[PDB]
Amino acid sequence: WRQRSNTQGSILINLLLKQPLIPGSSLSLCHLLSSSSSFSLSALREAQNLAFTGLNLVARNECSRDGDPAEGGRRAFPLCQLPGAVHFLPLVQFFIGLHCQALQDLSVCILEGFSVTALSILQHLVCHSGAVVSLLLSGQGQHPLLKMLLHLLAFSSAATGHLQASVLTQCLKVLVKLAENTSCDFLPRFQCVFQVLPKCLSPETPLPSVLLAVELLSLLADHDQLAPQLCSHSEGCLLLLLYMYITSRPDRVALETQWLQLEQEVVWLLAKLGVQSCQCNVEVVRALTVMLHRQWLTVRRAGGPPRTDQQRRTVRCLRDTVLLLHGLSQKDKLFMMHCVEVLHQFDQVMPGVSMLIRGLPDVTDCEEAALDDLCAAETDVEDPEVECG
Amino acid sequence: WRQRSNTQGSILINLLLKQPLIPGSSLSLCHLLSSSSESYDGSFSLSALREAQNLAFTGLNLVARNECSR
Amino acid sequence: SMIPALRELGSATPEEYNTVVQKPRQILCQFIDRILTDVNLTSVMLLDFIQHIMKSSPLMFVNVSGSHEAKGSCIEFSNWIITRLLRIAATPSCHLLHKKICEVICSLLFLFKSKSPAIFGVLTKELLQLFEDLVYLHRRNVMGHAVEWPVVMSRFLSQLDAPLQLMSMQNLEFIEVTLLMVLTRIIAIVFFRRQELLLWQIGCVLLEYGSPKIKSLAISFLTELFQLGGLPAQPASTFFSSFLELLKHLVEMDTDQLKLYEEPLSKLIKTLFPFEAEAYRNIEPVYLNMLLEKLCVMFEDGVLMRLKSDLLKAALCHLLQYFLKFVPAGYESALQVRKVYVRNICKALLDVLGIEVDAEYLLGPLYAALKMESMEIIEEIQCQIKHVDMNQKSILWSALKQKAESLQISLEYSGLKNPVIEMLEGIAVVLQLTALCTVHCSHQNMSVVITWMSLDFYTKVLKSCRSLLESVQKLDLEATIDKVVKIYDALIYMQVNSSFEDHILEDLCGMLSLPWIYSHSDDGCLKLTTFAANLLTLSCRISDSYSPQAQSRCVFLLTLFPRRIFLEWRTAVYNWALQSSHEVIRASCVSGFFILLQQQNSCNRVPKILIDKVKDDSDIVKKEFASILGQLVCTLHGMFYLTSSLTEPFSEHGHVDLFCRNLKATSQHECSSSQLKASVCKPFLFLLKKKIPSPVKLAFIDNLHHLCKHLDFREDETDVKAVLGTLLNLMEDPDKDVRVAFSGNIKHILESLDSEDGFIKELFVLRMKEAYTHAQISRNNELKDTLILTTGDIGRAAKGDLVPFALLHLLHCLLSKSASVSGAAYTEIRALVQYKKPICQFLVESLHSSQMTA
């Protein structure tokens, strides 16, 4: 390790100095750092100077040097401390607060655009920067930028308009990344963001934001306390809303591949909840069977192997959804009654995905057994032959 | 010799970075790289300024990444 | 074994299940102690017995109820078994036993995840922690910290027990390799979007350090991880740096090391840079720029020349292509910087072009860059049809022209320079790229036309072809023939674009017929042929050089020959092709006669001679004839004007050569008249095999999709009966995929039918009835599913009465309410968007059947 990964010690110093991380709008993190135009608007330039000092330090700062041995902790890929990166955060707070202030008001759309660019800057900072994550975790006047992300997310959750919509997505990216770098302990602190999430779960909410949200909900669910949060209300899980978004396919604009991505994400979430150590449950099985049905139909029609990447993802999600179904089946019989209303679509899809799985080298003994448990569909009601044709 | 060279390259990035390039001078390097463009204009299109600006951004990231040959 | 103990395992209460397991668990622990306890490749018998017990007594390994106590006890016992397995694995000598141990342990873990998802999660967390500790030990060894070669490294410790031995740093690498194999097996179960970072960390660290072969296995694990869930940004920087380091190292690698890392290295190159669109977004922009920079360095290094593995050179070319085509300029880096790095890569590519083992590797990327320059020229035209020379237009193109003129000049200059097979291969790659650009470069091909090589350069190339016709002592005669074939195919594509010269066309036909000329010299067209006269002597030599597959390529090129020139020589060449002495020769003969026949005369049904050869030529020949038949039907009476697709060689069909072979010709007015002929369909049906042509049958359905649109629909009831028989056979085929393809084409056919003829509709309903009756006779769910898909395709058609008939079939399934069938009707209305009213009538039918029941 002669190279010592000095650039890895760099917190994407290039990623900071690039075109807008959000596509379009020419946010220009440099233009923001240098911009002439929340509170204490005067001395926004002093914050800018703090950020320039931070950029110089990040360029010169290699905490992740010679493999980042000083870096230590349970989290994987512990980002270099990059204490200089932290100085960037006051500036981000400035524009983020500008957007928050617009939200507080019941005109400046471009003002929100800089705010989105700043959300992106915070996104890059949470990534590859340990100090930023530690600070945001340490924080009630705790982690004021964290509260600003929460309040912004909320303002978008309702009456977002087109401007807030993208802000929802980017702030979700940040909230999730800050969580991933964070430890389990931090997750108790983000449970409040767990309070903000339901509005994003709504059917009106776009598909991308809710995909980021499913990933976030899982990362939180890693923590036990967030796990009880996974279904804070017995009558209606946030997972209940997630199943509804999965079935409803409400966002037409989303491409089918994006739906697939949300599908595998929810498969992962159902799995993570699967390892612990409602109206939401029966609905879960209904949604799982319909999703498996759509994917398995897509696979079935095609005799050709899944050469393209998305079909490969499709076969994989077919396998894993098979596993989730097998687990739900083993845990209880309630699935079958819950299965009843879509039971026909289920028993139709399951044999077909089962055989497509059967025709695989990669098969687990586990997944084959998961099918074996189920995959008992006669597929013949057996009526008289006369007058059917 | 690259590591000392890498320090030199980071130094180049920092000089590119400094908040005032000339003391008392409002404009800063990032201000140039991304600019309002308020205002040779006949020689230079605002789009021409924009493409050169992109070349500059790529260059700044490259210089930061680079190690000096020395 | 304690089979009564196994039975008691079932008999024992879930509460006493732990005690029941302890009894046979005792014998199993003793057996492990016999072999597992000692360090040491019977023991294979032990691991197989372990797997057999896992299959036989799933409860024994993990209590079904668990009870929250027996489950923990099983976790401990499995942890002890894993400890023994790791004790076996750590040693390099016993590593082979560990892999089968890998199989047994992984299977039992899958079994626990099935039965005990939570206990399996705990065990997997312990395994991941053990992996993290092994990676930490490797990092301490490599960084230079205390090696700590002996360590307990205890993980998944069990009180009941054994001790977890630590291997010496290298054997610890081996134990880590076994753990990596297990993790690769279990990747899908593990990934939770949180442990994902841990898996990425284990992989990235393993890439940074460890054995080059261990590094390769780690690359494979990282590839599997990248396919599922992408690459997280935090992992991304380190993985990209390791990939750059591996690219730099590729030159300085052992040939055995290169063999070890090639397949995984290529898999990573492909998955990380998928030729498919939208791959660019996945990798970070700066990371992609770094990939471009490392590629520039490799090109400066001449890694193509240094590389001793073709697949690795192939992957480097794949990266070049991904950067050329699938990565948008101005995303990975600024435009001008991309152009500069690409210019450098192209210069290195030409340097490799000078002397080449295989042209195809250099072919693709140069093709994409020429296409990019062609788009640039088109934009030049878009803004203020006068031809601009390609070589003058593009520095790379003029450079290629210089390299080609140099190769030809050297071949002319020296006999030893004349004997440079690689130089000829390079000239050939130049010619093929020239032909592909001439096909696709022109913006009007996409006003000004750019020819990288001028027709006079083509003529100097013709003189070079004559020099190649000069005997090479027969040492490389066959390979020289193959290279001449590639050059001839390039000239043939240029001709299909437009005949280079009529005497050039004659010389081309002569060179094409050269291999068989000695046998064909006593031919009516041949003796007359001027090329034949001078040719006969070399053909005396050429015949030996000619080979069966090369001869088939020659026959294909000859069919390519334009009809205007040497048409009778072409007919004789086809007749010799009718001979089909070589099976691949027979296939190329079919491919070529496909073009030759209609050009010759009497536009009409497929030649009876070709039909007979198709009757029984080969299974592969059957498939090729099926693929041809679709176009042959359109061109039976059509002028069949040659049509050249651009055919960008991203995945060139077959060899990059025979690209002229993969061409399509269409008549302008043939579309005007479908001119359906049943007997013509009858010969295709005679070609079709119920089971023998089954993939050929699928290809035949694929072509039928195109053929159907050109269907007259004026056939007599007998001929329409014949087409319906073809459709019913399409349904009957055993392959379920065959039937699904049949319905897919049936959609286009129903569109094709001039109208949903009431008699035609009745015949379709009758075919469906015969099928459903054969299904009930079969009592086969699979045939039922095939018929259900057929009804679904009919509904997707929703054509005239056929729409009511398909609604009736959906009602048939629904009244059948077959568990598979159910909801397919719901899709049926979806495929739909009076039929429903027939549905109510069928419901009345259901009421009558119920009354029959009671």
PDB file of N, CA, C and O in Angstrom, chain C residues 288-326:
ATOM      1  N   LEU C 288     -14.872   7.877 -13.507  1.00  0.00           N
ATOM      2  CA  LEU C 288     -14.829   7.528 -14.920  1.00  0.00           C
ATOM      3  C   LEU C 288     -13.696   8.259 -15.615  1.00  0.00           C
ATOM      4  O   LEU C 288     -13.019   7.698 -16.487  1.00  0.00           O
ATOM      5  N   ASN C 289     -13.465   9.513 -15.236  1.00  0.00           N
ATOM      6  CA  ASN C 289     -12.327  10.223 -15.800  1.00  0.00           C
ATOM      7  C   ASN C 289     -11.032   9.521 -15.429  1.00  0.00           C
ATOM      8  O   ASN C 289     -10.096   9.449 -16.233  1.00  0.00           O
ATOM      9  N   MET C 290     -10.968   8.977 -14.217  1.00  0.00           N
ATOM     10  CA  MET C 290      -9.767   8.263 -13.802  1.00  0.00           C
ATOM     11  C   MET C 290      -9.602   6.988 -14.610  1.00  0.00           C
ATOM     12  O   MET C 290      -8.479   6.587 -14.938  1.00  0.00           O
ATOM     13  N   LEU C 291     -10.714   6.331 -14.929  1.00  0.00           N
ATOM     14  CA  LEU C 291     -10.652   5.170 -15.810  1.00  0.00           C
ATOM     15  C   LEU C 291     -10.094   5.565 -17.167  1.00  0.00           C
ATOM     16  O   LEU C 291      -9.231   4.876 -17.721  1.00  0.00           O
ATOM     17  N   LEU C 292     -10.557   6.694 -17.703  1.00  0.00           N
ATOM     18  CA  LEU C 292     -10.047   7.161 -18.986  1.00  0.00           C
ATOM     19  C   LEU C 292      -8.555   7.439 -18.904  1.00  0.00           C
ATOM     20  O   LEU C 292      -7.801   7.116 -19.827  1.00  0.00           O
ATOM     21  N   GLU C 293      -8.108   8.021 -17.794  1.00  0.00           N
ATOM     22  CA  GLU C 293      -6.695   8.359 -17.659  1.00  0.00           C
ATOM     23  C   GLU C 293      -5.839   7.106 -17.556  1.00  0.00           C
ATOM     24  O   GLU C 293      -4.779   7.007 -18.186  1.00  0.00           O
ATOM     25  N   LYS C 294      -6.281   6.135 -16.761  1.00  0.00           N
ATOM     26  CA  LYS C 294      -5.545   4.884 -16.670  1.00  0.00           C
ATOM     27  C   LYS C 294      -5.512   4.186 -18.020  1.00  0.00           C
ATOM     28  O   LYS C 294      -4.508   3.561 -18.382  1.00  0.00           O
ATOM     29  N   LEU C 295      -6.597   4.289 -18.789  1.00  0.00           N
ATOM     30  CA  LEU C 295      -6.600   3.700 -20.121  1.00  0.00           C
ATOM     31  C   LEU C 295      -5.606   4.414 -21.023  1.00  0.00           C
ATOM     32  O   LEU C 295      -4.922   3.780 -21.833  1.00  0.00           O
ATOM     33  N   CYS C 296      -5.512   5.736 -20.894  1.00  0.00           N
ATOM     34  CA  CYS C 296      -4.522   6.475 -21.666  1.00  0.00           C
ATOM     35  C   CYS C 296      -3.123   5.997 -21.325  1.00  0.00           C
ATOM     36  O   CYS C 296      -2.283   5.806 -22.212  1.00  0.00           O
ATOM     37  N   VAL C 297      -2.868   5.768 -20.039  1.00  0.00           N
ATOM     38  CA  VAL C 297      -1.560   5.271 -19.626  1.00  0.00           C
ATOM     39  C   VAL C 297      -1.309   3.893 -20.221  1.00  0.00           C
ATOM     40  O   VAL C 297      -0.222   3.609 -20.738  1.00  0.00           O
ATOM     41  N   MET C 298      -2.319   3.023 -20.181  1.00  0.00           N
ATOM     42  CA  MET C 298      -2.148   1.673 -20.702  1.00  0.00           C
ATOM     43  C   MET C 298      -1.858   1.709 -22.191  1.00  0.00           C
ATOM     44  O   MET C 298      -1.030   0.940 -22.696  1.00  0.00           O
ATOM     45  N   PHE C 299      -2.526   2.607 -22.911  1.00  0.00           N
ATOM     46  CA  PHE C 299      -2.276   2.742 -24.339  1.00  0.00           C
ATOM     47  C   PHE C 299      -0.867   3.251 -24.591  1.00  0.00           C
ATOM     48  O   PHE C 299      -0.184   2.785 -25.508  1.00  0.00           O
ATOM     49  N   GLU C 300      -0.410   4.202 -23.778  1.00  0.00           N
ATOM     50  CA  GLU C 300       0.975   4.643 -23.879  1.00  0.00           C
ATOM     51  C   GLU C 300       1.925   3.495 -23.567  1.00  0.00           C
ATOM     52  O   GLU C 300       2.991   3.372 -24.180  1.00  0.00           O
ATOM     53  N   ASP C 301       1.547   2.639 -22.618  1.00  0.00           N
ATOM     54  CA  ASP C 301       2.355   1.469 -22.300  1.00  0.00           C
ATOM     55  C   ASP C 301       2.325   0.433 -23.411  1.00  0.00           C
ATOM     56  O   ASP C 301       3.136  -0.498 -23.397  1.00  0.00           O
ATOM     57  N   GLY C 302       1.401   0.560 -24.356  1.00  0.00           N
ATOM     58  CA  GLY C 302       1.217  -0.489 -25.343  1.00  0.00           C
ATOM     59  C   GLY C 302       0.749  -1.780 -24.713  1.00  0.00           C
ATOM     60  O   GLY C 302       1.178  -2.867 -25.122  1.00  0.00           O
ATOM     61  N   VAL C 303      -0.138  -1.681 -23.719  1.00  0.00           N
ATOM     62  CA  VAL C 303      -0.595  -2.864 -23.000  1.00  0.00           C
ATOM     63  C   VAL C 303      -1.132  -3.902 -23.972  1.00  0.00           C
ATOM     64  O   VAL C 303      -1.045  -5.111 -23.725  1.00  0.00           O
ATOM     65  N   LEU C 304      -1.700  -3.450 -25.089  1.00  0.00           N
ATOM     66  CA  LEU C 304      -2.154  -4.387 -26.105  1.00  0.00           C
ATOM     67  C   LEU C 304      -1.005  -5.266 -26.577  1.00  0.00           C
ATOM     68  O   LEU C 304      -1.163  -6.483 -26.727  1.00  0.00           O
ATOM     69  N   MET C 305       0.166  -4.671 -26.799  1.00  0.00           N
ATOM     70  CA  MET C 305       1.328  -5.463 -27.183  1.00  0.00           C
ATOM     71  C   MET C 305       1.851  -6.260 -26.000  1.00  0.00           C
ATOM     72  O   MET C 305       2.233  -7.427 -26.145  1.00  0.00           O
ATOM     73  N   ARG C 306       1.867  -5.650 -24.816  1.00  0.00           N
ATOM     74  CA  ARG C 306       2.389  -6.341 -23.644  1.00  0.00           C
ATOM     75  C   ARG C 306       1.490  -7.501 -23.244  1.00  0.00           C
ATOM     76  O   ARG C 306       1.971  -8.540 -22.775  1.00  0.00           O
ATOM     77  N   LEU C 307       0.182  -7.342 -23.422  1.00  0.00           N
ATOM     78  CA  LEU C 307      -0.762  -8.332 -22.928  1.00  0.00           C
ATOM     79  C   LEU C 307      -0.524  -9.679 -23.594  1.00  0.00           C
ATOM     80  O   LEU C 307      -0.473  -9.784 -24.822  1.00  0.00           O
ATOM     81  N   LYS C 308      -0.377 -10.709 -22.769  1.00  0.00           N
ATOM     82  CA  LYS C 308      -0.241 -12.081 -23.229  1.00  0.00           C
ATOM     83  C   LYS C 308      -1.552 -12.856 -23.184  1.00  0.00           C
ATOM     84  O   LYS C 308      -1.552 -14.051 -23.496  1.00  0.00           O
ATOM     85  N   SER C 309      -2.658 -12.222 -22.796  1.00  0.00           N
ATOM     86  CA  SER C 309      -3.967 -12.862 -22.737  1.00  0.00           C
ATOM     87  C   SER C 309      -4.934 -12.105 -23.632  1.00  0.00           C
ATOM     88  O   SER C 309      -5.096 -10.890 -23.490  1.00  0.00           O
ATOM     89  N   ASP C 310      -5.581 -12.825 -24.549  1.00  0.00           N
ATOM     90  CA  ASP C 310      -6.486 -12.167 -25.480  1.00  0.00           C
ATOM     91  C   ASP C 310      -7.697 -11.602 -24.755  1.00  0.00           C
ATOM     92  O   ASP C 310      -8.092 -10.453 -24.986  1.00  0.00           O
ATOM     93  N   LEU C 311      -8.284 -12.387 -23.854  1.00  0.00           N
ATOM     94  CA  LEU C 311      -9.484 -11.938 -23.167  1.00  0.00           C
ATOM     95  C   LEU C 311      -9.223 -10.640 -22.422  1.00  0.00           C
ATOM     96  O   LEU C 311     -10.092  -9.766 -22.364  1.00  0.00           O
ATOM     97  N   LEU C 312      -8.031 -10.497 -21.845  1.00  0.00           N
ATOM     98  CA  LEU C 312      -7.692  -9.251 -21.168  1.00  0.00           C
ATOM     99  C   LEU C 312      -7.567  -8.108 -22.165  1.00  0.00           C
ATOM    100  O   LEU C 312      -8.069  -7.004 -21.922  1.00  0.00           O
ATOM    101  N   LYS C 313      -6.906  -8.353 -23.296  1.00  0.00           N
ATOM    102  CA  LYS C 313      -6.888  -7.354 -24.354  1.00  0.00           C
ATOM    103  C   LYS C 313      -8.303  -7.076 -24.832  1.00  0.00           C
ATOM    104  O   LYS C 313      -8.653  -5.931 -25.148  1.00  0.00           O
ATOM    105  N   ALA C 314      -9.142  -8.111 -24.855  1.00  0.00           N
ATOM    106  CA  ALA C 314     -10.526  -7.922 -25.258  1.00  0.00           C
ATOM    107  C   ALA C 314     -11.242  -6.989 -24.297  1.00  0.00           C
ATOM    108  O   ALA C 314     -12.016  -6.124 -24.713  1.00  0.00           O
ATOM    109  N   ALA C 315     -10.977  -7.136 -23.003  1.00  0.00           N
ATOM    110  CA  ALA C 315     -11.635  -6.289 -22.018  1.00  0.00           C
ATOM    111  C   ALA C 315     -11.107  -4.866 -22.079  1.00  0.00           C
ATOM    112  O   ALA C 315     -11.862  -3.907 -21.888  1.00  0.00           O
ATOM    113  N   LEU C 316      -9.810  -4.704 -22.324  1.00  0.00           N
ATOM    114  CA  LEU C 316      -9.283  -3.360 -22.515  1.00  0.00           C
ATOM    115  C   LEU C 316      -9.965  -2.691 -23.699  1.00  0.00           C
ATOM    116  O   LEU C 316     -10.356  -1.516 -23.631  1.00  0.00           O
ATOM    117  N   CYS C 317     -10.156  -3.441 -24.785  1.00  0.00           N
ATOM    118  CA  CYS C 317     -10.904  -2.910 -25.916  1.00  0.00           C
ATOM    119  C   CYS C 317     -12.339  -2.600 -25.515  1.00  0.00           C
ATOM    120  O   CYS C 317     -12.929  -1.622 -25.987  1.00  0.00           O
ATOM    121  N   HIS C 318     -12.919  -3.426 -24.645  1.00  0.00           N
ATOM    122  CA  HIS C 318     -14.275  -3.175 -24.177  1.00  0.00           C
ATOM    123  C   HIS C 318     -14.349  -1.856 -23.433  1.00  0.00           C
ATOM    124  O   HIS C 318     -15.317  -1.103 -23.578  1.00  0.00           O
ATOM    125  N   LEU C 319     -13.327  -1.558 -22.635  1.00  0.00           N
ATOM    126  CA  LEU C 319     -13.291  -0.278 -21.940  1.00  0.00           C
ATOM    127  C   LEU C 319     -13.171   0.860 -22.940  1.00  0.00           C
ATOM    128  O   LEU C 319     -13.845   1.892 -22.812  1.00  0.00           O
ATOM    129  N   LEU C 320     -12.330   0.677 -23.956  1.00  0.00           N
ATOM    130  CA  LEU C 320     -12.195   1.703 -24.982  1.00  0.00           C
ATOM    131  C   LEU C 320     -13.536   1.970 -25.643  1.00  0.00           C
ATOM    132  O   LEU C 320     -13.913   3.123 -25.875  1.00  0.00           O
ATOM    133  N   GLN C 321     -14.287   0.909 -25.913  1.00  0.00           N
ATOM    134  CA  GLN C 321     -15.574   1.073 -26.572  1.00  0.00           C
ATOM    135  C   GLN C 321     -16.578   1.732 -25.640  1.00  0.00           C
ATOM    136  O   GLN C 321     -17.355   2.593 -26.061  1.00  0.00           O
ATOM    137  N   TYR C 322     -16.576   1.340 -24.368  1.00  0.00           N
ATOM    138  CA  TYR C 322     -17.502   1.942 -23.420  1.00  0.00           C
ATOM    139  C   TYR C 322     -17.257   3.434 -23.325  1.00  0.00           C
ATOM    140  O   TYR C 322     -18.203   4.226 -23.239  1.00  0.00           O
ATOM    141  N   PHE C 323     -15.990   3.837 -23.358  1.00  0.00           N
ATOM    142  CA  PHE C 323     -15.675   5.257 -23.304  1.00  0.00           C
ATOM    143  C   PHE C 323     -16.043   5.940 -24.613  1.00  0.00           C
ATOM    144  O   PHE C 323     -16.445   7.108 -24.623  1.00  0.00           O
ATOM    145  N   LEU C 324     -15.907   5.226 -25.732  1.00  0.00           N
ATOM    146  CA  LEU C 324     -16.173   5.835 -27.030  1.00  0.00           C
ATOM    147  C   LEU C 324     -17.660   6.069 -27.242  1.00  0.00           C
ATOM    148  O   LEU C 324     -18.064   7.111 -27.773  1.00  0.00           O
ATOM    149  N   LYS C 325     -18.494   5.118 -26.832  1.00  0.00           N
ATOM    150  CA  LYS C 325     -19.890   5.069 -27.244  1.00  0.00           C
ATOM    151  C   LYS C 325     -20.874   5.257 -26.101  1.00  0.00           C
ATOM    152  O   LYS C 325     -21.742   6.131 -26.178  1.00  0.00           O
ATOM    153  N   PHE C 326     -20.770   4.467 -25.040  1.00  0.00           N
ATOM    154  CA  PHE C 326     -21.803   4.440 -24.015  1.00  0.00           C
ATOM    155  C   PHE C 326     -21.600   5.492 -22.933  1.00  0.00           C
ATOM    156  O   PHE C 326     -22.515   5.719 -22.135  1.00  0.00           O
TER     157      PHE C 326
END
